């Protein structure tokens, strides 16, 4: 029964098979993790070292969405700055839906999941309305 | 559910709550895993008794005591070890190595010993003894 837990990119794999279905993955993570805590109110040393190998797994797992996190801030930092057309193509952009995605991966992360960018993730957000203010000021 | 099994449970309550409390305290427990050897956490202990602990005591008492000795005793009498003295080690297949016996009577170095034993406990008398005719030595 301790055999059953023997287990690291294999996580990256899991991912590889793929929203909400990421907290669920941590979430099942968190059940081995209630698990193992019901059976050392069952049985230490074989327990405390797979113990620390949990504190391996789930924050190595959070790493490898947080760099996809920071991907996901650096390519947002990106966009961040017949010309008609374009103007009226960038007019159209759900581009809002497109920040709010990358703010639940990060926030749900940061916080039911527990850098200085929380600021910058802010002023991503007031971006948009910066970016309406040079707009209206790109409309003459 | 027998009468010695009684004696023994009544005999390592007294072991664990040694300073005569009537219920099991932690540091009675601690001072038990301390004798044995171990040192662990004010946490997991915690855990443990809260298991075990049915009346929210805090502190377990004797039937309780017999109710964890209960479920590990009789959840998993004379079957297991004539049974696992030699042909459990074969698992229902009823074919003994004779080499096993030769390294039996080798590492206990004793003195003179034939082995028409298994010579003339031959049932099947083929070279090998069955679970059956196995109990039949015995």
């Not at chain 1, 802010?122 to 203010?133: D, E, F, N």
């Not at chain 2, 004798?35 to 008794?49: H, K």
């Not at chain 2, 964890?68 to 070890?81: F, H, Y």
Request: aromatic share 8%.
């Amino acid at each position: 029964t301790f055999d059953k837990y023997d287990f690291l990119q294999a996580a990256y794999d899991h991912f590889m098979r793929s929203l909400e279905a990421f907290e669920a993955e941590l979430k099942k993570y968190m059940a081995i993790e209630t698990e193992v805590t019901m059976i050392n109110g069952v049985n230490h040393p074989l327990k405390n070292s797979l113990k620390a190998e949990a504190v391996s797994w789930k924050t190595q797992f959070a790493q490898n969405l947080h760099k996809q996190c920071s991907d996901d801030l650096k390519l947002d930092n990106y966009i961040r700055d017949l010309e008609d057309v374009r103007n009226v193509m960038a007019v159209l952009k759900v581009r809002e839906k497109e920040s709010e995605i990358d703010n639940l991966i990060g926030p749900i992360e940061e916080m039911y999941g527990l850098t200085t960018m929380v600021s910058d993730l802010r002023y991503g957000w007031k971006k948009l309305k910066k970016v309406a203010t040079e707009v209206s000021d790109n409309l003459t | 559910l027998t009468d010695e099994e009684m004696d023994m449970c009544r005999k390592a309550f007294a072991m664990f709550d040694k300073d005569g409390s009537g219920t099991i305290d932690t540091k009675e427990l601690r001072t038990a895993l301390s004798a044995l050897g171990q040192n662990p956490t004010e946490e997991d202990m915690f855990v443990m008794i809260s298991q075990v602990d049915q009346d929210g005591s805090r502190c377990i008492e004797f039937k309780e005591f017999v109710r964890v000795i209960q479920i590990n005793k009789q959840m998993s009498a004379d079957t297991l070890d004539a049974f696992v003295a030699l042909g459990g080690n074969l698992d229902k297949t009823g074919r003994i190595l004779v080499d096993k016996l030769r390294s039996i009577c080798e590492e206990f170095e004793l003195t003179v010993n034939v082995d028409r034993l298994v010579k003339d406990a031959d049932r099947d008398l083929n070279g090998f003894l069955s679970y059956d005719e196995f109990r039949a030595l015995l």
